[PDB]
Design a protein around this ligand. Structure first.
Ligand code: NA
Ligand SMILES: [Zn+2]
Ligand SMILES: [Zn+2]
Length: 218
């Protein structure tokens, strides 16, 4: 398995890439973000493991940042795998009510703090959380960095195919993608969990893949 990667996109924004073997898929590549506000660092999704989460935290703490918070974009272990370790270090973990419910229902450790706001500031004017509706999962949400015009679309953005459909809502995904396109068309950069970073068109590609996946199912 390749090592954890940490790449600077620009001032105060880093992409973390972690790797895991998943039954039926082989080696899954997973992207998340670390966002800096002054000397405060926020994790957008945890790596797959406690081990990679610790390495990621140490990399930023060693450079003089303090980890103020982590948010999980949905309940699957590629977003939530580090939550138990973060909870053991009293680093605050956040997830939607629905995500914390789906973590419980599936016998996994919950984020410490749950929210039900559809759209709100994680950090005022720096980090926005938005739920476009069901798609990849019932709970999937996105994170918006207004100052850098970067959207983190998580496992919702699927420009090359929908991946794992087990927890997906094919009926809703196309409407959810249209809602995301109307809200975040001014995006310079879209970071997805499982494909290369791209421009705002990745949201259209996802809509197209969602319509096709719906048609192929019915
Ligand atoms: Na700080
Ligand atoms: Zn997922
Ligand atoms: Zn995923």
């Amino acid at each position: 398995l390749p090592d954890l990667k940490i790449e600077k996109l620009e001032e105060g924004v880093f992409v973390h890439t972690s790797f895991e073997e998943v039954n039926g898929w082989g080696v899954v590549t997973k992207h998340g973000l670390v966002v800096l506000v002054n000397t405060d660092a926020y994790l957008i999704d945890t790596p797959f493991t406690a081990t990679d989460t610790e390495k990621l935290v140490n990399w930023f703490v060693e450079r003089g940042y303090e980890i103020k918070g982590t948010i999980s974009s949905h309940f699957h272990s590629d977003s939530t795998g580090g939550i138990e370790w973060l909870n053991s270090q009293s680093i605050p973990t956040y997830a939607s009510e629905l995500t914390n419910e789906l973590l419980k229902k599936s016998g996994k450790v919950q984020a410490k703090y749950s929210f039900s706001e559809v759209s709100y500031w994680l950090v005022k004017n720096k980090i926005e959380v938005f739920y476009p509706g069901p798609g990849h999962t019932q709970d999937n949400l996105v994170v918006w960095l207004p100052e850098s015009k970067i959207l983190f679309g998580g496992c919702f953005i699927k420009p090359h195919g929908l991946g794992n459909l087990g927890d997906a809502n094919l009926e809703a995904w196309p409407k959810s993608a249209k809602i995301l396109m109307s809200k975040y068309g001014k995006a310079k950069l879209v970071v997805s969990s499982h494909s290369e970073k791209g421009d705002a068109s990745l949201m259209k590609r996802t809509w197209e893949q969602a319509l096709k996946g719906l048609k192929e199912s019915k």
